[PDB]
Design a protein around this ligand. Structure first.
Ligand SMILES: C[N@H+](Cc1ccccc1C(=O)NCC1CCCCC1)Cc1ccc2c(c1C(=O)O)OCO2
Ligand SMILES: C[N@H+](Cc1ccccc1C(=O)NCC1CCCCC1)Cc1ccc2c(c1C(=O)O)OCO2
Lengths: 149, 149
């Protein structure tokens, strides 16, 4: 579970926000892209796995599951590519909630930047620092450190 | 010590690679940009600080030290903006070496992507996973987790 991430795609202002959630902590990375392609998703995964020890990715849809570019990135970075079927029905609800919370933070910061990408990065910052008392940022670091030991 | 990062700018193929180094571990983040501007540097810092607990940034040059956009990003993300003066002369030598090693990895992966940005992310991945037997990736996590406890 320290190595499991879930991909998530949401829309705002005619653009796409691509999100990876570290499942055990709720810590997130996110980027704005014009549209979700195999290439964009493969590139995002490569960035993510250079930064965190990514063992498993649950892809956000069947297109990214199927995508040969996505599979090439997962091969490259040593990631086990998995489906994102919520065999646990609570998974749908956790992600739906996260999308709504992210969008609310984006709306709270939206006037502090011209570009959506800036607002989304501000939202990422606030989400990962929010104490719920540990933050998601602290949780992921603790989970991975325990693992290394 | 857990919160100290150093900005570093290097060139390749007529483009700019902006690097942040976590000093205590040697762990890096990097991006390709067409030129180093205040806005690009500010945006990169905002991404960095949503991801890692960034307390201090030693900026890479006086322009970025001076830049009001960079100061705005550091204010935003709660970062102390500092100069990068190598009062310890071993600092220039560490960065120069890091730049040469990154450029060497990029040349080794260069044919595996059309775009420089992809090669640079492959280089980031390889750098952070390289065991020296702990990796930079393992050191940053252990250092930050030790600090949290
Ligand atoms: C040039 N604008 C001016 C601006 C315009 C409108 C509203 C607020 C501001 C403003 O100064 N906000 C303060 C924040 C600036 C970001 C760091 C945190 C403080 C900001 C900016 C800088 C760098 C970027 C941007 C943007 C963007 O506007 O999206 O997009 C990609 O790299
Ligand atoms: C479309 N190209 C094809 C290609 C072209 C030339 C040489 C090798 C390859 C190739 O297949 N590389 C193997 C894989 C290595 C891990 C990453 C996934 C590709 C790859 C690619 C995908 C996504 C991107 C890119 C690029 C890029 O070429 O820079 O740039 C921004 O998002």
């Amino acid at each position: 579970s320290p190595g499991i991430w879930q991909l998530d795609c949401t829309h705002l202002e005619g653009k796409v926000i691509l999100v990876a959630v570290h499942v055990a902590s709720g810590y997130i990375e996110a980027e704005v892209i014009p549209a979700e392609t195999g290439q964009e998703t493969a590139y995002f995964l490569l960035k993510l796995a250079g930064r965190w020890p990514v063992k498993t990715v649950h892809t956000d849809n069947g297109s990214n599951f199927t995508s040969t570019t996505v599979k090439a990135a997962c091969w490259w970075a040593g990631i086990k590519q998995e489906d994102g079927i919520p065999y646990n029905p609570q998974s749908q609800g956790v992600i739906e909630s996260m999308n709504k919370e992210l969008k609310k933070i984006i709306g709270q910061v939206r006037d502090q930047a011209e570009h959506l990408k800036t607002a989304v990065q501000m939202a990422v910052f606030i989400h990962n620092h929010k104490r719920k008392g540990y933050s998601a940022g602290e949780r992921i670091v603790d989970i991975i450190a325990t693992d290394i030991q």
